Each structure stands twice: as structure tokens, then as C-alpha cells.
Structure 1
Amino acid sequence: ALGKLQDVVNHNAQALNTLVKQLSSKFGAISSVLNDIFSRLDPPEAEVQ
């Protein structure tokens, strides 16, 4: 019957987990690693990603 209390814990954990997952998303850029963008691309094109 403590599911209602548990749901609050899960909801916060689920939301926080989503935030961490969103970090790995490239969001349309070539890669999700910041240093990779700067190193591989020239500074003019790198800033676009």
C-alpha cells in the first residue's frame, strides 16, 4: 500500500535518470563528446555543433 510513497521516489529517480541519459544524446550534432567536436572540427565549424 506504500506505492504512493514509492511513486514519488521513482518519479524523481526516473526524471533524474532521464536528465543523465539526455547528456549522451547528440541532439543532431556529429558526436556527444565536447572535446571530440573541438578536436575533430575546425573552430569555425566546431562551434556550430
Structure 2
Amino acid sequence: SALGKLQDVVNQNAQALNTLVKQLSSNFGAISSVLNDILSRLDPP
């Protein structure tokens, strides 16, 4: 009143879970990254 070995595990896991959510706003080379605007501005083919 040290415990950095316990904080590192929590930090690495939270930081790896934040990247997975941030990867959802990327187009990866499509027009946009949101599955509706791609879908309501083009026809199926």
C-alpha cells in the first residue's frame, strides 16, 4: 500500500479485444465498410 505481472495479462487481453472491434471499420478494398450502404447502393451481381 509489484502487481505488474497481473496487470499485463489484463492489459494485453483488453488491447487485443479492442483491435478486433476496430477492424470492423475498414473496407479492405471495397467501396465502404458498412454492409448496408454497399447493399443499398448497388444491385446483387
The answer to whether TM tops 0.5 is yes
Identity %: 93
Work out which structure has the larger RCO, using CA pairs closer than 8 Å and 6 or more positions apart in sequence: 1
- Segments of 4+ moved more than 4 angstroms: none
What TM-score do the two structures reach when normalised by structure 1?
0.82
What TM-score do the two structures reach when normalised by structure 2?
0.88
Matched residue SS, 1:36:
coil
Structure 1's unaligned 5+ residue stretches are 45-49
Distance 1:19 1:7 in 2: 19
Structure 2's unaligned 5+ residue stretches are none
Compare CA radii of gyration and give the structure with the larger one.
2
Which has the larger share of helix? 1
The count of residues paired between Structure 1 and Structure 2 equals 44
Cα-to-partner distance string for 1:16-43 (whole Å, 9 max, x where unaligned) = 0000000111111110110111111111
Q: Indicate the RMSD between aligned Cα atoms, in angstroms.
A: 0.7
